Amino acid sequence: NFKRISYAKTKTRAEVRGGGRKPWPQKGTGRARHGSIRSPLWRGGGVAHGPRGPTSYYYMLPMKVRALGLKVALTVKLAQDDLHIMDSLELPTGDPQYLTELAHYRRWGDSVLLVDLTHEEMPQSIVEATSRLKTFNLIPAVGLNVHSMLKHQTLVLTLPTVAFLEDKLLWQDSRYRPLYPFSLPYSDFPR
Amino acid sequence: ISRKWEKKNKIVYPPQLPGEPRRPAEIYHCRRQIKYSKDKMWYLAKLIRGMSIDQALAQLEFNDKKGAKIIKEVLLEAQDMAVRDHNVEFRSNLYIAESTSGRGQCLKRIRYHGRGRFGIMEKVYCHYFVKLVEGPPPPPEPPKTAVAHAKEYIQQLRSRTIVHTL
């Protein structure tokens, strides 16, 4: 929801073209009294309470809550035997068919999420194998999120990724309250 | 719009067994968008309902209503169609089975009144539907007599039970 921007918008009775003229006099005509032909009661008129886009649903959870969401997401995967640790993402061949058969033999699942430490150090064997697949996705360590992990039945991590996650996640558990945003220089940040 | 009455003539029945009785011939014909009121047309359709084909024509020939000429033209082309297409031996054998009128697509005009007032006049159109069944017309139901009334009344007195008990 936080990145959702809703663009739906309708025109109120003040934005519908025309309708500045009173249709018939207040009394005498024997009909209902109206002040404009663009009121919500009229056909072709405005909407009383309609969408007024663009609308933003942006909100930020506390940093520790978002970091604790990752730990619970990782814990749930391991507790359910859906997390597999690797040493590297180097395949013998760049054939996408090899990756599908490798996952089916080990009974990983219909969807497997592959995580690497960085984006520029991803081996070309796994990049060519996953780019042609739809349920086998390759993301860097920084692109890890709860929605991707829950969407995919099986999660695959490398040894550098595990060390990266623990360093990033456990830093939230024992840290001072921020004087200024951490993007500014500190004594011992980044690690 | 609906044009089912035309399709009711295109249904073909399976061949009858030798022991089965003769099936009367059914002819469905109609004329659409007649410039006539369906309310006025109903009186003419009610008149010839249940009559023979020749008896219906005689009543319509000397009737002064405008629809009488229109309905008579429909019966003549329906009688011709039965012999030509529906395998009917005698054209006079037919009798009127179903004859009704229906509302048709109507126009809307403006009828001017005084004091700058107006009314919405409609140019009414109607449909006429007729069904012909081969064979003599069924005899009219005889009026209920005293013996029929007495028999029914005694039957009501015999079918009554002791209510609100065992």
């Binding site: 009394k27 005498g28 005509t29 | 004091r115 700058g116």
Partner: peptide, 15 residues
């Protein structure tokens, strides 16, 4: 008792 007159409203002709 002021004379009040309500002019008739002519509907559009297309109807």
């Amino acid at each position: 008792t002021k004379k009040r007159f309500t002019p008739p409203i002519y509907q559009p002709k297309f109807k």
